[PDB]
Structures are given as C-alpha cells and as structure tokens.
Coordinates of C-alpha atoms in Angstrom, one line a residue:
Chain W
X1 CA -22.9 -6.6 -18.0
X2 CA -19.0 -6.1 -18.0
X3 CA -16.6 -8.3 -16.5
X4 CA -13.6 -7.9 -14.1
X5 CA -9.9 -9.4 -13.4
X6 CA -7.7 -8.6 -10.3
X7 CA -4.8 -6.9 -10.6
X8 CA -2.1 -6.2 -7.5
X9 CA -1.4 -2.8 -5.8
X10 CA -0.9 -0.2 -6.0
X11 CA -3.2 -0.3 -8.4
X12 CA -6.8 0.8 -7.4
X13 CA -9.5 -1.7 -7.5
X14 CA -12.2 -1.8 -10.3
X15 CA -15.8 -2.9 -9.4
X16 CA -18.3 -4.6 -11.4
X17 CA -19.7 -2.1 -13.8
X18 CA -23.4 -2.2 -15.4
X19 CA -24.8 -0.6 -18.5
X20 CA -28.2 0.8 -19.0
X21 CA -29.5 1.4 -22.6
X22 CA -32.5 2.5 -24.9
X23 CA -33.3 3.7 -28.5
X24 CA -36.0 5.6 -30.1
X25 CA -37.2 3.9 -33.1
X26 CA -37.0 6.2 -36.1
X27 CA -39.7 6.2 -38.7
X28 CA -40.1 6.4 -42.4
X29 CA -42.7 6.1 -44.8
X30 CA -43.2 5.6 -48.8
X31 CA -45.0 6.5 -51.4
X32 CA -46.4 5.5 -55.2
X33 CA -49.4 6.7 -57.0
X34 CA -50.8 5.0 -60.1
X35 CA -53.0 7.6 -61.8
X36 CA -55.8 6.7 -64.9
X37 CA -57.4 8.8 -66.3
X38 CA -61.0 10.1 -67.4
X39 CA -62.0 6.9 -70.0
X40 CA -60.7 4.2 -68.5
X41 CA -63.4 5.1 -65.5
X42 CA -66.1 4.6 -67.5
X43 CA -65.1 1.7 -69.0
X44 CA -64.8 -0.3 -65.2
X45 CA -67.8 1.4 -64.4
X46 CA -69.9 0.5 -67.4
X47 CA -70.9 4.3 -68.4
X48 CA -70.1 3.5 -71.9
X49 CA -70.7 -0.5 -72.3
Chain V
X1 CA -44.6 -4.5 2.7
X2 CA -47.2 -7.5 2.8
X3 CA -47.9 -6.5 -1.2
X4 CA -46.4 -8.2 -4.0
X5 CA -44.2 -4.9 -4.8
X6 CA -42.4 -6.0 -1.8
X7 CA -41.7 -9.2 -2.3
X8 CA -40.8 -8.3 -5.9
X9 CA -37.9 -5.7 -4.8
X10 CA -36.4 -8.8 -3.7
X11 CA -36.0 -10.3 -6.6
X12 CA -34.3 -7.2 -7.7
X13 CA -32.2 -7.3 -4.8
X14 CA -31.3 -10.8 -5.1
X15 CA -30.6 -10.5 -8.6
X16 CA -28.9 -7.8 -8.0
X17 CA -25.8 -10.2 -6.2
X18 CA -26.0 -12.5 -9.0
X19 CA -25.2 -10.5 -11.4
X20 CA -22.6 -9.0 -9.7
X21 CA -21.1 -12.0 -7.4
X22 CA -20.4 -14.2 -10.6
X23 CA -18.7 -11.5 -12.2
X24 CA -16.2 -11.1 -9.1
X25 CA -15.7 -14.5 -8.9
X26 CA -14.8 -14.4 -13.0
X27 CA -12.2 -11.9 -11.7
X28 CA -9.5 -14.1 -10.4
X29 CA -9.4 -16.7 -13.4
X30 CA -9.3 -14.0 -15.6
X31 CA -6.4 -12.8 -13.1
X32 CA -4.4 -15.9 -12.7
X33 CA -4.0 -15.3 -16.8
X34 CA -3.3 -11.9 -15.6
X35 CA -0.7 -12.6 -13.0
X36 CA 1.5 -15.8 -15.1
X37 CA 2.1 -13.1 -18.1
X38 CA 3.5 -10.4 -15.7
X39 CA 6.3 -12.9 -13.8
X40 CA 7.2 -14.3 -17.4
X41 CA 8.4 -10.9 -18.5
X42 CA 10.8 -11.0 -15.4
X43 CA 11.9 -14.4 -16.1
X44 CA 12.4 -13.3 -19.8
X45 CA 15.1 -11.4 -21.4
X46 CA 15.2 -10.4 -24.9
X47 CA 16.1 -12.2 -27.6
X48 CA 18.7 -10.1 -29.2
X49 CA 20.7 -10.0 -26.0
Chain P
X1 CA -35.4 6.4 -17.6
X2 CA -36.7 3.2 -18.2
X3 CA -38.5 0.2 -17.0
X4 CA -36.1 -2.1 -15.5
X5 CA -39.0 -4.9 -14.4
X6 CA -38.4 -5.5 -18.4
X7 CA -35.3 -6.4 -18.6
X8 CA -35.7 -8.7 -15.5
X9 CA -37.4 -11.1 -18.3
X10 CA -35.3 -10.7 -21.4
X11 CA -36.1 -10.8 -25.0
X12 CA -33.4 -11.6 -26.8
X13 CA -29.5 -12.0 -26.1
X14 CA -26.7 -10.3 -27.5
X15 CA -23.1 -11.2 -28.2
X16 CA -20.6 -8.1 -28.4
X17 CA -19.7 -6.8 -25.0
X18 CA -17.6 -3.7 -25.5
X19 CA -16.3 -0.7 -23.4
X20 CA -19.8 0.6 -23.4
X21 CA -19.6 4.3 -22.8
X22 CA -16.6 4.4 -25.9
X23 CA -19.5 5.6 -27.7
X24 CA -22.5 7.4 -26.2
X25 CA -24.1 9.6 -28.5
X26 CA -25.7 6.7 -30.1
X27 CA -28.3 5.6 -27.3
X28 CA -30.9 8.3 -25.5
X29 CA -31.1 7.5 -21.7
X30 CA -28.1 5.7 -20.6
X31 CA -26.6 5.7 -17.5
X32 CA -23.0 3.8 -16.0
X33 CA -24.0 2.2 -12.5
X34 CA -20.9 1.5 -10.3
X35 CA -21.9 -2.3 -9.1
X36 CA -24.9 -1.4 -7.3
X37 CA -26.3 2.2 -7.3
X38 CA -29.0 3.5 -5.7
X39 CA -31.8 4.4 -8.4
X40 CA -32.2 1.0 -9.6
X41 CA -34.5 0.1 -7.1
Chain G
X1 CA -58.9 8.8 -30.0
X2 CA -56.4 6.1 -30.0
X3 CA -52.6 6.4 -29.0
X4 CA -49.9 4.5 -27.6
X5 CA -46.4 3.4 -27.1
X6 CA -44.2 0.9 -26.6
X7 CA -41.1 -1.2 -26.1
X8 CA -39.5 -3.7 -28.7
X9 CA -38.1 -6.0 -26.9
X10 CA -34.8 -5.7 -24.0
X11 CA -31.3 -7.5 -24.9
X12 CA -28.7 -8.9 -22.1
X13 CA -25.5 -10.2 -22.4
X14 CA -23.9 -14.2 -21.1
X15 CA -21.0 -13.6 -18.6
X16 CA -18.8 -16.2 -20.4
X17 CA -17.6 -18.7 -17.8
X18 CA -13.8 -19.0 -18.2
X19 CA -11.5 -21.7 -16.3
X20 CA -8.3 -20.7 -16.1
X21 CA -7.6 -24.7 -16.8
X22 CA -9.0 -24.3 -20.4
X23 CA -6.5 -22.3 -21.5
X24 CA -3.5 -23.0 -23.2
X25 CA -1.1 -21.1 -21.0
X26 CA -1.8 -23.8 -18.2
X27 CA 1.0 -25.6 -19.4
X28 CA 3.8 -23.0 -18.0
X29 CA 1.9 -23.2 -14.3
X30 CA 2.3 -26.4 -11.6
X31 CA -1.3 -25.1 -10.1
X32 CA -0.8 -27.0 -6.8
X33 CA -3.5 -25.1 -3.8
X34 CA -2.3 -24.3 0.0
X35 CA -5.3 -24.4 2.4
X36 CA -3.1 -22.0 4.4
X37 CA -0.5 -19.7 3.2
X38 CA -1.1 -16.3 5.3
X39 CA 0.4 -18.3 8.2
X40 CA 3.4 -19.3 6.1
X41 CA 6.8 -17.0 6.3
X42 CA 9.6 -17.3 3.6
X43 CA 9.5 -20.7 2.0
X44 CA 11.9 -22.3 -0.4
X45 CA 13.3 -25.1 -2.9
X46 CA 16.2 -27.1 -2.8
X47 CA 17.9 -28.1 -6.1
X48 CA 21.1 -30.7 -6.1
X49 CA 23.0 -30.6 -9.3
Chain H
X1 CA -16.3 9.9 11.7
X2 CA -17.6 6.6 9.6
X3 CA -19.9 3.9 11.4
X4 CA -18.0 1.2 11.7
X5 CA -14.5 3.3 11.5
X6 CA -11.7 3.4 9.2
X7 CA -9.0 1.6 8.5
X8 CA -6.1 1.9 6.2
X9 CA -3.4 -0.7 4.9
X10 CA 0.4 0.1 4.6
X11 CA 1.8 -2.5 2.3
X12 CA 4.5 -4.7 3.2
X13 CA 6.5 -5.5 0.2
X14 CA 7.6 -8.9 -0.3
X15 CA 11.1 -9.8 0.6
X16 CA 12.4 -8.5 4.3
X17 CA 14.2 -10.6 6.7
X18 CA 13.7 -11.6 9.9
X19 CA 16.2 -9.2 12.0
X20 CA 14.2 -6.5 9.5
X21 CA 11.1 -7.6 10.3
X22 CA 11.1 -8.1 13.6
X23 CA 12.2 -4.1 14.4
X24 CA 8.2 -3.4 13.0
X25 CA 6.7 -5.3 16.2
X26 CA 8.4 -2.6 18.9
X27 CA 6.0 -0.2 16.5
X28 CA 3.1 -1.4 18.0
X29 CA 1.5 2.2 18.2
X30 CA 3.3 4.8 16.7
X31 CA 2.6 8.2 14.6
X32 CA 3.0 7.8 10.8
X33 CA 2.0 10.7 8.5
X34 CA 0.3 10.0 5.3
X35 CA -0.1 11.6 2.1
X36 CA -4.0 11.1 1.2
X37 CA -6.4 9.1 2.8
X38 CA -6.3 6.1 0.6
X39 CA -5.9 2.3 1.6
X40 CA -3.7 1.0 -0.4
X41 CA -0.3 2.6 0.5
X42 CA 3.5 1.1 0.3
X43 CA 6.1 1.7 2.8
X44 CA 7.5 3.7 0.2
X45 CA 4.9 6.6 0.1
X46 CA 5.4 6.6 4.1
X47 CA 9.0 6.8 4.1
X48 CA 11.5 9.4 4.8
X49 CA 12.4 8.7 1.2
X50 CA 9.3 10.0 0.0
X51 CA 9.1 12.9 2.5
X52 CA 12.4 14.9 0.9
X53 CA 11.8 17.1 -2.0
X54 CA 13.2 17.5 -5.5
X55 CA 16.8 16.6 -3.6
X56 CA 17.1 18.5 -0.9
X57 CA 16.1 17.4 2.1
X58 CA 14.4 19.7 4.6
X59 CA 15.8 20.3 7.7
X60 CA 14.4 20.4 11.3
X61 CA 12.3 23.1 10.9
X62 CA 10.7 22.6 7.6
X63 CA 10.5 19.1 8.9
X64 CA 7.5 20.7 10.8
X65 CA 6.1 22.5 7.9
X66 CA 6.2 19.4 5.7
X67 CA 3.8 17.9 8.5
X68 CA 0.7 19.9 8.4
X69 CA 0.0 18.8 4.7
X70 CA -0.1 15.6 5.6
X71 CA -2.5 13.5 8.2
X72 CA -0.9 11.8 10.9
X73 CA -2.2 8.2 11.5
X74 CA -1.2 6.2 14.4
X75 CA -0.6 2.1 14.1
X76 CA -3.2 0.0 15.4
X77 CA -1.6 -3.6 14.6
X78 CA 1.2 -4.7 12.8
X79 CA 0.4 -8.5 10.5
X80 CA 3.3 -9.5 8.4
X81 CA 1.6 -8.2 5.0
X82 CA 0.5 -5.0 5.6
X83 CA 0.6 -2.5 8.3
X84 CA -2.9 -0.9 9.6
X85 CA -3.2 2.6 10.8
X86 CA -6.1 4.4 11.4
X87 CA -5.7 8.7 10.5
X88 CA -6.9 11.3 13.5
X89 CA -8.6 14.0 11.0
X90 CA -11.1 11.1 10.1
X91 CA -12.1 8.8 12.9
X92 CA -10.8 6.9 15.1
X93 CA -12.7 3.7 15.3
X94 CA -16.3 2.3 16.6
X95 CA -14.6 2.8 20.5
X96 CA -13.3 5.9 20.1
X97 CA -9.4 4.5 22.0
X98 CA -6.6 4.2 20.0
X99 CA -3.3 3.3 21.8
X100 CA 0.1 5.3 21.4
X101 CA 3.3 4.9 22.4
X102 CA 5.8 7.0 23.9
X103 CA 9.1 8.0 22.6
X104 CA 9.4 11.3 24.8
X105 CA 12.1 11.7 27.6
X106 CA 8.7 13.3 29.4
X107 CA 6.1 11.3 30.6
X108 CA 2.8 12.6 30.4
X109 CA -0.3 13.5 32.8
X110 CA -3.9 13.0 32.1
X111 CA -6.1 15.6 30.1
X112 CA -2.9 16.9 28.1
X113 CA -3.6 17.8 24.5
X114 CA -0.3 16.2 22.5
X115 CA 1.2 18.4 19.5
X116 CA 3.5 16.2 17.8
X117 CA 7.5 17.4 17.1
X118 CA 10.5 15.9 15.2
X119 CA 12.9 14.4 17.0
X120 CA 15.0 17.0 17.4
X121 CA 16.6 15.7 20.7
X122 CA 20.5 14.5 21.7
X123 CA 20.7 11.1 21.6
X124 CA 16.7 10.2 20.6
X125 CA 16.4 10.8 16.9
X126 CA 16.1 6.9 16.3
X127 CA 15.6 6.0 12.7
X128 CA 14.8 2.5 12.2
X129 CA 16.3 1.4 9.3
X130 CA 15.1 -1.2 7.0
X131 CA 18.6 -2.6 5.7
X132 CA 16.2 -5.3 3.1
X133 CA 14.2 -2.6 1.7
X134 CA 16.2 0.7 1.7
X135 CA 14.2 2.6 3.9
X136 CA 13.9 5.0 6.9
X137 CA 11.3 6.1 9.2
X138 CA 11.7 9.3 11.3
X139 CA 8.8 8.9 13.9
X140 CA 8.0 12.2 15.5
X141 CA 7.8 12.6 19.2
X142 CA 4.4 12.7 21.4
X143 CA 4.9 15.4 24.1
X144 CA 2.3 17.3 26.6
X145 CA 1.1 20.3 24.3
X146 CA 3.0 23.6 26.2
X147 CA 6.3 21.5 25.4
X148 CA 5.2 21.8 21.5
X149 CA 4.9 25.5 21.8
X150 CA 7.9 25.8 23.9
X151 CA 10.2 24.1 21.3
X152 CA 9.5 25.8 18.1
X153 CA 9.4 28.8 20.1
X154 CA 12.8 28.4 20.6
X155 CA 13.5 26.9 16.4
X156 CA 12.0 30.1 15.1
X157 CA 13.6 32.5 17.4
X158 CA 16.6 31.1 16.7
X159 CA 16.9 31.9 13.1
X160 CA 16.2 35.4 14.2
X161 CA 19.6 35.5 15.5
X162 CA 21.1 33.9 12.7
X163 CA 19.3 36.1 9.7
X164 CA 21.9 39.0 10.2
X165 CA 22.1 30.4 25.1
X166 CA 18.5 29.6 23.7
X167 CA 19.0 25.3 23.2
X168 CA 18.0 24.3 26.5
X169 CA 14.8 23.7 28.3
X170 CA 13.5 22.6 31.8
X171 CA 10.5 20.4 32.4
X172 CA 9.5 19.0 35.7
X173 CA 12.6 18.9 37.3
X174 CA 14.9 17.6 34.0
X175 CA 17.6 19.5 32.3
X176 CA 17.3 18.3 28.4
X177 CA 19.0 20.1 25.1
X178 CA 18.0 20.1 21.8
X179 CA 20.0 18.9 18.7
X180 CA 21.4 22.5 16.9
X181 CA 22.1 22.3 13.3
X182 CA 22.0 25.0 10.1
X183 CA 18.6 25.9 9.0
X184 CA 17.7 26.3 5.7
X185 CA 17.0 29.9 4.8
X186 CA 14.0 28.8 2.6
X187 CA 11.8 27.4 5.3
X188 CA 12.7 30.3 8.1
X189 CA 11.5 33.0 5.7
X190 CA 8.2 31.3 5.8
X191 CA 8.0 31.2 9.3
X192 CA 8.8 35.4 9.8
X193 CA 5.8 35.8 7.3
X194 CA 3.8 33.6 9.2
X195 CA 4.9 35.8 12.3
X196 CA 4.3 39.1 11.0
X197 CA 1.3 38.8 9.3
X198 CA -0.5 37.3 12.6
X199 CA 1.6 39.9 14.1
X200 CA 0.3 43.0 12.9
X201 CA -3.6 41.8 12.3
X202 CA -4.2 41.8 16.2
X203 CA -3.1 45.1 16.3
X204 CA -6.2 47.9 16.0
X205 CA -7.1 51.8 17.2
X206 CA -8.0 50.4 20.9
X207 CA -4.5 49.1 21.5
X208 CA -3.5 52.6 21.2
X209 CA -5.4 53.2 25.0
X210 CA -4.0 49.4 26.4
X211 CA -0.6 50.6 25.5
X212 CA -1.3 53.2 28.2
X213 CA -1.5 50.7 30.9
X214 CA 1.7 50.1 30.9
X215 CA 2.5 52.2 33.7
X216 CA -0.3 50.5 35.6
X217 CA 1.3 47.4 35.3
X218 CA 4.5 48.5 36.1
X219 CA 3.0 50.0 39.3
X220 CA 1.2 47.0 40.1
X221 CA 3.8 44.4 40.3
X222 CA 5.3 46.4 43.1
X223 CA 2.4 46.1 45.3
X224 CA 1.1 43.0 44.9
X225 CA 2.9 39.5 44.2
X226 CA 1.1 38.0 41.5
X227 CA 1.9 40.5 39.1
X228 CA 6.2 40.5 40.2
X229 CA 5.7 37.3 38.5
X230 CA 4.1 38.2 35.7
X231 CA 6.4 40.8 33.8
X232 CA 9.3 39.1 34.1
X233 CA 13.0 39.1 34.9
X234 CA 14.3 39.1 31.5
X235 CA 10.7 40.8 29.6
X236 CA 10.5 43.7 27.0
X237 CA 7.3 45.8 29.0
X238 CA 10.0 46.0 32.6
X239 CA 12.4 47.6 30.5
X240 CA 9.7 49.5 28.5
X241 CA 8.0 50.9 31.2
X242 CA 11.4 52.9 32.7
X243 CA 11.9 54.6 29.4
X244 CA 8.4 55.2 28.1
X245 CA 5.8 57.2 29.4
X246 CA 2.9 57.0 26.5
X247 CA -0.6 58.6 26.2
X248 CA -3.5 57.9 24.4
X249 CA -4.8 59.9 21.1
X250 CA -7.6 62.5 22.7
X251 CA -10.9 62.1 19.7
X252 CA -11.8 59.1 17.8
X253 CA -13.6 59.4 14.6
X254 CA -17.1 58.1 15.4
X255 CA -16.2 57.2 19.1
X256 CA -19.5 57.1 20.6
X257 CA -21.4 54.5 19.4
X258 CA -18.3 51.8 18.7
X259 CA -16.6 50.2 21.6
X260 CA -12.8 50.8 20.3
X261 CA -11.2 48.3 23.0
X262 CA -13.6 45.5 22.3
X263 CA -12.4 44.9 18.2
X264 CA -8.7 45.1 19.9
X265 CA -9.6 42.2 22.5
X266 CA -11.8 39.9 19.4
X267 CA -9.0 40.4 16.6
X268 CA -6.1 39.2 19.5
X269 CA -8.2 36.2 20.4
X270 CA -8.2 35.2 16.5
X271 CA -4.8 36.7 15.2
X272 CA -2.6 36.7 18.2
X273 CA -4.2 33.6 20.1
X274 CA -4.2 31.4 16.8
X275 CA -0.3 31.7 16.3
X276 CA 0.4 28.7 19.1
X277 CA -1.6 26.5 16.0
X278 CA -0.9 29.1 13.0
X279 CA 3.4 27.4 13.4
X280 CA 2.7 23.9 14.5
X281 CA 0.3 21.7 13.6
X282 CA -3.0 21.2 15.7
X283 CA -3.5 19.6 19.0
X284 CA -5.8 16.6 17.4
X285 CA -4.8 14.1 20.4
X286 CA -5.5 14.0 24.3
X287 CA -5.0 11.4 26.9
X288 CA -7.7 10.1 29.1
X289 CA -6.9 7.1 30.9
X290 CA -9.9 4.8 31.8
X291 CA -8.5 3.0 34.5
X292 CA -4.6 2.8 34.7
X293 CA -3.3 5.9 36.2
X294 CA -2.9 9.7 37.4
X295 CA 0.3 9.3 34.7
X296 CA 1.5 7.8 32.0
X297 CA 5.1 7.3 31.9
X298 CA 7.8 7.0 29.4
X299 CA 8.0 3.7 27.0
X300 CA 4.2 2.6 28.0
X301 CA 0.8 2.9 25.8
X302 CA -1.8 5.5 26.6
X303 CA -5.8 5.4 25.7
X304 CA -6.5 8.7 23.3
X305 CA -10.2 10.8 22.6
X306 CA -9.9 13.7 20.3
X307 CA -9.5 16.7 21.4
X308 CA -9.5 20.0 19.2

C-alpha cells in the first residue's frame, strides 16, 4: 500500500495505488553417502563373532 | 445474497475505503510539507548574489 | 492470480515500501490496481 | 496418492501516520485555520515601521 | 454522453483585480474552444495567446481553420476560482439545456442550427482584455446556420480575386459589412484544395447526360415562375445556356444493367453536399425554446439541444 501527497495544477492528480504480489518457492536438495564395506557387515551382524 | 459470501464481499468493500480513505487523508500533511518548500524557494535568493 | 481472502488476515508485516513496479521481474503474478479496480472483488 | 500446495504466509505494509506538526519545518509556518476562506476576496497585512 | 454529465474547470490564477474581474460575470454563457478534454485548464491554454502559432498569428480565415481542431465549450457559471464549461462533442449535462448568449447583430428564430464564426464584423470584434493577467479572449459569434455558410462563402471567394463589391450582406431587412483585411496565402491555399477536391469527386459519367438539361432549364424558367427565380440574375448556367448547346455521349460501357445517373446523384449528396461542413465547422448547436418565445433576440440567453 503506497501513499499520496497533493500537489497544485496543472499538475494531474495521482490516486491511491495498490500492489499485488507472489513468489514461487524454489527448491533444493542435498546429498552425502557414507559407504562400508563387505567386513564391517559381518562384524554388526554377528556372521563372524 | 442471504449467504455468508455476501456479507463477506462487504468486508472487502469496506476495507476497501480504509485502505484507501486514510491514505488520501495522509495526502495533505504530506502536502502542507509539500507546499512550505515550494513558496520558500520564491522567498529565497541565492546566496552568492 | 491469487487468493486475496488471505491477505485480508495478514501473516506477517513488512517495512520497506518502495516504487513497487521499479522492479518486476522478480515476483510471478503481479498486478498495479489504480485505487479500486474491478477484479478484486 | 498424496499431493498438495500451499501458501507461506501474506505480508502488508503500516501506512505511517505523519502530522505535519511533528516535523521540524513547523517552525517557519504560523498554522492558524479559516473555517471559511472560499468566501474571502483579496485580504492583506498592515505593517507600520 | 456521461450519466450525471461533464464538467470542466478553467483555472483562475491568483492575482486579478476587481475592474478585471468583474468583466468575467457579463460572460455568463459564452463559447470558449478548448484544446483536449481535460479538467484542469488555465486561462492561459484558452487564451488567444495560446491560439497563435510559432509567431505568426493567423488571420481571419485560418482563424476558422484553427477552430475545428479544437472543441467548443460553452460557460455554465462563472465562481471566482475557476471557470466551468461544459464541451458540445461530449455532453451536455443530466437536462440536456445549456444557456448561451448572443453577441450577433442577428437575433435568432427557433429550430435554427448555429455554426459559430469569428468576429469578423465593424465595430463588434470585442476582445476583453485582462489588463492583471496579460490576456485576451476573442469569443466567436453565434449566428443562424445559412449566415455561417454565407460568410465564408464570401472569405474564400475573396481570395480568389486576390490570388492573381463582395463585403456586404443582407439579412432580414439589415444592411451589415464585414471587416476586410490581407489574408494570409498559407491558409487560402488550403481552402482551394479543400474546394477542388470536393469539387471534382461529385463529378461522374451520368453528369455527362444532366449537363444536357441545361436547355431544359433554360426553357423552363420562361414559362413558369418558380424556375425565373431559380437561375439567377447574375448565375453562370443563364449565361451558359446562350452559348452552349451540349449533347450526351451516345454508348456506355456496360450501360444496361448500371443506372449511370443514380452514382452521379449519391456521390453529389456526399461530395458536393458535405462542402457547407467540409469549410466550417459543424452545426453541433440548435435553439429550442421551452417556454419564452417565437424569437430570441440580440443580448439575451437561449435554451440549446444538439443538433447534428
């Protein structure tokens, strides 16, 4: 919402002006991997306890 | 209507005006600012003269 | 075109008012209404 | 399935309120108010020196 | 036409005096030509000091062209700020009556349409003035519309004679002269094209067998009386007729199924008949008196509904 003054001819008169606004959200995502490998397996497990 | 859609374009409607009234009446004191700084340039001569 | 029952309710509150449509490419529907026009109803 | 959308939320602004007697500038006015001046023709002031 | 009409306002700036003010208020309805159809105009923008050109000022007959780019608006009320008209192209107000004022030597009767002229008269091109403000207002002159086409009649024919008496009219009964001065060869040129090209449009293959009428006509007007008056003393055709004996061209190309006199009679009614608007301006403004009078004489108001 904008605001106004007054002003004297000949100058024309301005009105009250209005805005009306949106966005689209942009989006991202992430990554991160962790890897083990073939012993360590067994050894959560209990294959070779 | 008799529905609540009608009495709720109203409040559009009357909300409408208040937004807009108040900033018509913030035109003249944001005028009378206005209108003291363009007679004191015609009171005013330059100062190297 | 969006839902203007809501912004009758706001969320939040801003606190930069600026010549508005200075920049436009920034928003997606926008739309300068002259005091009252006649699609906001 | 399971989709949707949404909106985040809806921002306004404040109409700041501004007297013109809050300013600094006031001092340079005599703000005295006619109830009438459209009726009024060419008035003056009288200054003895 | 709005709903509720339209209403313009001709600033008034702020310092005038009271001997300039007070020659606005015998301006009660007057005609006053604007520029664009705005509301916010200065006295300035309807002054003659804004009607003149790069420097030169146009003279009596350019005075007319200079009009019919711009729309005439007639005073409705005069408060000391502003000045409200009301234009005749737009609207005229919720009533429909908007009252004039004469400045005319001619009074007028009811029904006539009013084509508005400079005032080119002796002793009536009355400028007020304004002394306060530097500024001058040429008001044109209200007339009944045959006057209109009588006048310029005589302003473009008399450039004819100049470009290598006529001055003085009658009207009901009143010997009055208009004000001769040199015309500016710009403006006159503009009027001969405006001639010829309406000129020459009406004329078609069927005014090749109208042409041999002629001595019909010239026969006629010595049997009966209606026609004597019709040629005239002074006319081209009477002094045609005794020296030309014309015929019409035997085949047309394609002649039966076209009728060749009826595109000779449509083009004249659009060409030919246009020309009385095509050099003036147009007949917006007729008088129809409610309840006052048969006439309405010199120096008095007069109700107004448009008229095209």
């Amino acid at each position: 919402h904008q605001p106004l003054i007054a002003r004297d001819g000949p100058h024309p008169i301005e009105q009250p002006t209005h805005n009306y606004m949106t966005k689209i959200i942009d989006r991202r995502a992430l990554n991160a991997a962790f890897s083990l490998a073939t012993e360590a397996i067994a050894l959560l497990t209990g294959e070779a306890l | 209507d008799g529905t609540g859609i009608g009495a709720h374009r109203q409040l559009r409607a009357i909300q409408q005006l208040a937004r807009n009234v108040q900033a018509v009446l913030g035109a003249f004191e944001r005028g009378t600012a206005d209108q003291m700084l363009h007679v004191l340039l015609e009171k005013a001569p330059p100062l190297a003269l | 075109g969006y839902r203007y029952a809501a912004a009758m309710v706001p969320t939040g509150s801003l606190l930069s008012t600026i010549e508005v449509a200075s920049h436009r490419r920034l928003f997606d529907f926008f739309s300068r209404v002259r005091s009252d026009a006649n699609s906001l109803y | 399935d399971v989709e949707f959308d949404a909106l985040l939320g809806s921002y306004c602004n404040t109409l700041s309120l501004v007297r013109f007697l809050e300013l600094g500038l006031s001092v340079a006015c005599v703000c005295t108010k006619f109830p009438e001046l459209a009726y009024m023709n060419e008035g003056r002031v009288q200054f003895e020196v | 036409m709005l709903a509720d009409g339209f209403e313009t306002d001709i600033a008034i700036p702020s310092g005038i005096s009271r001997p300039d003010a007070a020659a606005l208020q015998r301006c009660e309805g007057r005609v006053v030509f604007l520029p664009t159809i705005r509301r916010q105009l200065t006295l300035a923008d309807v002054a003659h000091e804004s009607f003149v050109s790069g420097g030169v000022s146009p003279d009596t007959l350019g005075l007319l062209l200079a009009y019919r780019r711009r729309f005439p608006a007639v005073i409705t009320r005069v408060l000391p700020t502003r000045i409200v008209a009301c234009p005749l192209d737009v609207g005229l107000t919720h009533a429909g009556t908007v009252n004039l004022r004469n400045t005319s030597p001619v009074d007028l009767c009811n029904g006539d349409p009013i084509s508005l002229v400079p005032p080119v008269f002796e002793g009536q091109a009355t400028d007020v003035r304004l002394d306060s403000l530097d500024l001058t207002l040429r008001f044109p002159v209200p007339l009944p519309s045959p006057l209109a086409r009588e006048i310029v009649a005589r302003l473009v024919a008399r450039g004819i004679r100049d470009l290598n008496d006529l001055n003085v009219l009658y009207y009901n009964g009143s010997r009055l002269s208009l004000l001769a001065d040199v015309q500016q060869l710009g403006p006159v040129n503009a009027e001969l094209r405006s001639l010829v090209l309406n000129m020459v449009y009406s004329i078609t293959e069927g005014t090749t067998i109208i042409l041999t009428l002629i001595p019909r006509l010239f026969a006629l007007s010595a049997q009966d009386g209606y026609v004597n008056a019709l040629l005239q003393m002074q006319s081209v055709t009477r002094e045609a007729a005794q020296l030309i004996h014309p015929e019409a061209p035997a085949l047309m190309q394609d002649g039966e199924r076209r009728l060749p006199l009826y595109e000779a009679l449509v083009a004249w009614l659009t060409h030919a008949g246009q020309l009385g608007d095509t050099l003036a301006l147009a007949p917006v403004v007729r008088v129809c008196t409610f309840d006052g009078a048969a006439v309405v004489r010199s120096g008095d108001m007069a109700p107004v509904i448009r008229y095209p």
